[model samples]
Target: DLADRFAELERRYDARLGVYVPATGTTAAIEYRADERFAFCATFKAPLVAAVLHQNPLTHLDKLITYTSDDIRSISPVAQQHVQTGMTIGQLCDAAIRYSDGTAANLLLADLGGPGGGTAAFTGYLRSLGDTVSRLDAEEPELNRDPPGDERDTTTPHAIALVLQQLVLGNALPPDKRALLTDWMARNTTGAKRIRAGFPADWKVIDKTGTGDYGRANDIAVVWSPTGVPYVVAVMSDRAGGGYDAEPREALLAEAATCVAGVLAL
Candidate 1:
C-alpha cells in the first residue's frame, strides 16, 4: 500500500521524493528511493554545525582573520558590509547556521578542513556514537559523481531521519555540543508548515528547510504530537519546482504528509 502511494506520488511529484516515519524507526510507512542520493543543499549544514562547534566553541577564544568583502564578516573592529571585518570561529558558525549563509559555510568549510574536510571529522564523531551507516562527504564529491559546488551535499534517508531523532532526545548530543545544535535547530523556523501540513497545528515541530536549483527542496523535521510523541519526517523533492510553497506541489505533499503523520502517530 505504501508502495502504491509512492508510485502515485512519484508520478504526481514529477519530482524526486522520499519520506521516513519514526515508529519502530521504520522506513516502512512511506516509500521512495531511500538509498538514492542527491545534492542535499543546506540540510548538510547541520552536521557542519556540529563539527564546527566541537572544534571551535566560539570565535571569542580564537584569533580569527579578517576579510574585506561586501558580504564576508571578520573579527575585532566591527565594519559594515564591504568594509571588511574580523571573525572568531564562533561567529562564522552562527552566521552560517542562523541565516543559512553561504559565506559563513564556505569559511567554516576551510576552517574545519576545507573542500569537505570537516565533513570527515563529523563522520568520525557520528560513527563513534555508533551511527555506522553515516559517512562524511568526499572532499571532491565530483570524483564520486556529485558536483561539490552544485550545492550537492551527501546523506542517506536513514542518517537524516536519525539526526532529527537525535534532536528529539533532548540535548541528544553530548553535553559539550548538545545545546549548540539543539538551539540552532530550535531557532530554525524556515520550513515548518510547508511540509508538515498533515499534522495538526498544535503539534510542536522543529525543522530545517533546504532548497537548491533543479527543484531540489526538502524539509528534515522532528514533529511532536500531543502525546509528546516524537517522530522524524524527512522529505526531499527535486521536481521542476518542488519545494516549500510551490502551489499544487505543496498540496500533493500535504496529501502524502497526512499519510505520514497518521502512520507515525501510531
Candidate 2:
C-alpha cells in the first residue's frame, strides 16, 4: 500500500521519489526507493554542522570569523547581511542550518579544511556515523550542480535518515550540541511547504531542507508523535527530465510527506 501510494505520487509529478521513515513503537519502518541516490542539496548542511561540533570544543563555537562580500553566495540571505560585522562559528551554523545560507555553509566547510580536504573530512564524519552511502565533493554552489547520474554531493534517503537520527536523537553529538542542532532544525524557515506541511499543527517538527538543480527537493527530519516518540523521515525527489530550475516542485515533496503521514497513521 505504501509503495503504491509513492508510485502514484511519482507518476503524478513526473518525478522520482525516495523516502525512508524509521519505525516507532507502533508502526514498522517504511521504505520506498530509500536506497536510491539523490542530490542532497541543502540537506547536507545539518550534518556539516554536526561534524563541526564534533571536531571542536564547545568554546570553539564562540570564535568569530570575518568575511567580505567576495564570500557571499547566491542564496546567502543571512551571511550577506553580516559581511562587514562578521559572524561567530555558532552563528554561522545557525545560518547554515536554519536559513540554508550557502555562504555560511562554505565558510563552515572552509573551517573544516575546504575543497580537497574539507569534503573528505565531512564524508569521513558521515562514515564515522556508519553512513557509507553519502559523499560530499564540493562546496556550496558547485555542489548543488546535481546533474543526473553524477555521484558528487549525493546521498541515499536511508543513509541520510540514519545520520539525522544519530545527530538529533542518537549519540553523534554531545547532549548540549545535539540540543543546539535540534533547536536550529526546529526553527528552520525553508521547509514550511515541504515535509512540515504534512504534519498536524500541534506536532513538533525539526527539519533541514534542500533544493537545487535537476529538480532536486529534499527534507530530512525528526518529528515527534503526540505520545512523545520520535520518527525520523527523509523524503527526496527529482523531476524526470533532469531540468535545472531555481524553483523546484515543492508540492511533490508535500505529497510524499502525505504518504509518510498515511503510513504512520498521523
Candidate 3:
C-alpha cells in the first residue's frame, strides 16, 4: 500500500521520490530507491555538525569564533544578525542545524579544515562512520548545483538515514553531544511544511531539510509516535524538467510522510 501510494504521488507530481524507513519494533521497513543517489543540498549540515562534535570535546564547543563580513553568505539569517559579535562553536552548530545557516556551516568547516580540505574533511568523517556512498565535493551554494548524473555532494536515502539514526539514537556521539544535535533538529525552523506537516499533533518529529536546483527537496527525520515508538524516515525528491524556480514539492513530501505513518499504524 505504501509503495502504491508513493507511485501515485510520483506520477501526479512528475517527480522521482526516494524513501527509506528503517525497521522499528512494531513496523516493518520500507525502501523505494533507497540506494539511489540524490543530491544532499543543505541536509549535509546535519552531519557537518555531527563531525564538529565528534572532533571536539564538550568544553571546546563553548569557545567563541568570530567572523567578519568576509565570512558572511547571502542566505545566513542567524549568522548575519550576530556578525558584529560572533558566536560560540555551540551556537554556530545550533544556527547551522536549526536555521540551516550556510555561514555557520562554512565557519565550522573552516575550523575542521580550511576551504582547501573542508569538503574532503566532511567526506572523511562520513567514511569514518562507514558510509562509503555519500560524498561532498563543494561548499554551500556551489554544492547546491545538483545537475543530473553528477554524484558530487550526493547521498543515497538509505545512507543518510542510517547515519542520522546512529548519530541521534546510537552511540556515535557521547550522550550530551547526541542530546545537543537532537535538540537542534527537534527545533528546526525550516521543515514545518515538509515531513513535519504530515504527522499528528501529538507525535514528536525532529528533522533537517534541504532544497536545491532541479526541484530537489528532501527531509530526513526521526519521529516518535504518541505511544513512544520511534522511526527514521528519509525522503528525497526531484521534479522532471524543473529548474531554479521549481516549486520545492513540500506537499509531496508531506504526503509521503503520511504514507509512512499509515503503514506503521502510527
Candidate 4:
C-alpha cells in the first residue's frame, strides 16, 4: 500500500522518489525514467561538514581561510555581500550548510587536502558508512553544475537514505558532532519552499536541501516525533524542467513523511 501511494506520486510528478523509515526498517521508493546520473546538488556538503568536525571538532572549525578570486568561482551569498576577507572554517560551514553557498563548499573542498585528496577522503567516508554508488570526483564547481550530456555527479535514493541514516543514528560521527550537524541542518533556510513546507509547525526537522542546474530538488532529513521515535527520510528528484513548480515534489516528500510519522506514532 505504501509503495503504491509513492508510485502514484512518482507517476503524477514524473520523477523518482525514496522514503526510508529507520524505526520500522521499511522503505518506499519509485524510479520513473532515465538511466542518467542525477546531480547531487549541495547534499554532499552536509557530509563534508560532518567529516571535518569528526576529524577535529575543536580547532578545525576555528581555522581561518581567506577568500580569493578562486573562492568566488560560484554562488556565494556571503562572498557577494562581504569583501574577500578571511573567515573561520566554522563560518564557512555555516555559509555552505545554512545558506547553501557554493563558494564556501569549494573552500571546504580545498581544505580537504585539495581536489584529489578531498574526493578520495569523501569516497572513503561513504564506503565506511556503507554507501555503494556515490562519488565526489570533481570539486564544487564541476560537481555542482548540470552534467554534460547524461553525466552528472550522482547518487540513488537508497544511497542517500543510507547516508542520512548513518548521520541520524550517530554511526557516521560522534553524538556531539552529530548534534552539531543536525542543529545546522535544522536552521537551514533554503528548503522551506521544498520538503520543509510539508512539515507541520511543531515537528523537529533537520535536513539539507539541494538543487542542481536541472530540475533536481532534493531534501534529506532526520525527523524527530513529538511523541514517538525519530526517523531518517531522504526525498530526491530530477523533475521535468527548471521552471517546473517544485512544490509538488516537496509535497510528495512531506506527504511521505507524514505517512511515516503516523506509523511511527502508532
Candidate 5:
C-alpha cells in the first residue's frame, strides 16, 4: 500500500528520487527508483559533521568558531537573526544539524582543516565505506541562492543508506562519536515537519535536511520504529520546483517519509 502510494507520487512529480531501506530479516525493506549516482544531494553535505569529528581537529568539539559577514552567504534562521558572536564547535554542530545552518556548516568545514581537508574528510569517509562517487564540493544556502551555480553535491541513495547503517551500527565511527552525531540528528528541528510530519507519534527520526537549486529537497533519516525495527531512509530529488511557498515540495517529502514508515509498520 505505502509502496504503491510512493510510486504514484514519483510519477506525478517526474522526480528522479532514490530510496533505500536495509533488507531486514522479518521483511525486506523498500527501494524505489533507486539510482546508481544521483546528483546534487542537499543533505549529503551534512555528513561533514561526521567527518569533522572523525578528523578530530585540535580541541575538536570544544573549540569555538566565529562567523563573519563573509560567512553570511547562506540561509540560517539562527545566523540571520544575528544572535550571538560565536559558538563552540559542538554548538556549531548542533546548529548545522538541528537548524540546517549553512553558516555553521561552512564554519565546520573551515575548522575541519579548511575546504581541502574538509571535503577530503567527507569523501574519504564515504570511500572507506566503499563509496566511490559521492562528494561534498560546495557551500550550501549559497549554492542554492539566486543565480545558482552549476556546481552541486552528489551521492547515491544506496551508498547513503549503507553509510547510515554503518553509523547506526557502530561500523563507521566509534560508539562515542556516533552517539554525538546521532544525538544532534535526533534533536534536529529543521526536518521535523518534512519526513516526520506524517509519521506515527512514537516513531522518532534522527535526520538531516538538504535543499538545492530548483526544488531539490532531501531528508535522510534513521527511522526508529515501535517494533524495534530501525532503518535508514534517504528521500532525495533534484527537480522539485523552487519558490517562496514551499508547501508543495514539502508535502511530497512528507509523504515519502510517511510511506517508509507505513511499509516498516507492517
Candidate 6:
C-alpha cells in the first residue's frame, strides 16, 4: 500500500519532493520547510485564530456584521453566496479564515475600520513578536484585500510560520492571552478537505486555507498532536499548472499530516 500510494502520488505531480525535519523553535518534533513562502490563500488566518484568543480580540463579539450581499460581492465572486446578516464577530472570524469565506473577511475588516487599519494592527502584533514579513494590503470591496500589488496586502512565509509558532507555543502573548487564542482557534470552522483529510476526527488543529486566481493559494495549520506535542504545516502556491486535480499540491495536505503523524512518535 505504501509503495503503491507513493508511486501514484509522485506521478500525479510529476515531481518528488518534500522536506521534513524538526521544527525551528524546538528539537522535540519534526517539521517541514516553513521559511519558504507560498501563496497563503485563505490560510492566512490560521495564526489570527490564535491571535484573537490571545488578545481576546472579540471584546463585544456578540454583535453581527453589517455588510450586504453587494458588499460581499465586492470581495470575491465566491463570497457573494456566503453573505448573510447579523452574524457575530466570533462567527465571522470562524467563517472568514477557517472556511475561506471572503465575504466575512471583508465585512470584518470593514467593521474594524477598513482593511488597512485592522490588518496593520495584525501586522503590528506580529512585529512585536519579532516577525517582519507578514503584512496586509488594501483595495476595494474591502472584504478581501487585493493581490500583492492590486488588492493591497501580503504576508511572507517566515512571518506566517512565526505566527503559527508563536500562537501554539504561547510565545507571542502572555499566558492568559495564549489561552484565549487557543480556545478560539479550537472553535474554528472546518469544511475544507485538504488539510483536514487525514488528521484524526478527534484531534484538533488551529488552521486556515486560502485559494484564489493567481495571487494566493495557501493552507497553513498548527496541529496539537495527540502525543501532547504541537507541529506546524504551511503550504502556499501562487502558480497553477495542469495538476489541480492530480498533484501533491493539494493532495499533500493529507500526506503532510501523515508525515507529521508518523514523525510524532505516537
Query: TM-scores of the models, in the given order?
Result: 0.72, 0.96, 0.96, 0.83, 0.84, 0.68
Going through the candidates in order, what is the number of backbone clashes in each? 10, 0, 0, 0, 1, 18
lDDT of candidate model 2 versus the reference: 0.88
- Give one digit per residue, the lDDT tens place, for model 5 in 147-262: 22333356767767777777765556777888888898888877866778867878777888877655667778887777666777877765534443332366677878777776
Q: What local distance difference test score does each model get?
A: 0.58, 0.88, 0.88, 0.69, 0.69, 0.53
Off by over 4 Å in 5: 1-4, 39-42, 57-59, 80-84, 114-117, 145-152, 240-248
lDDT of 1: 0.58
Top-scoring candidate (lDDT): 3
Q: Which scores better on lDDT, 3 or 6?
A: 3
Worst lDDT 10-window in candidate 2:
239-248
Model 6: runs farther than 4 Å from truth? 1-33, 49-58, 74-85, 111-117, 139-156, 171-184, 187-192, 200-203, 215-217, 241-249
- Summed over model 2, clashes come to 0
- 142 in model 1: Cα distance from truth in Å? 10
Cα lDDT tens digits, model 4, 28-125, are 33332212345677888888887677767567888988866655777788755655568788888888899998888877777777447477777667
Give a tens-digit lDDT track for model 2, residues 117-210.
4888899889999999999998888888857889889999999999999999888899999999999999999999988898877668899999
Q: In model 5, where is the ten-residue run with the lowest total lDDT?
A: 143-152
Overlapping backbone residue pairs in candidate 3 total 0
Q: Taking the tens digit of each residue's C-alpha lDDT, what string does model 1 give over 124-233?
A: 66665455655646432221234323332556566677766664464545665766666666676455555557778778766666665555566777777786766677
Q: Which ten residues in a row have the lowest lDDT in candidate 3?
A: 239-248
**Whole-structure CA lDDT of model 6:** 0.53
When sorted by TM-score, best at the front, the candidate numbers are: 2, 3, 5, 4, 1, 6
Q: How would the candidate models be sorted by lDDT, starting from the highest?
A: 3, 2, 5, 4, 1, 6
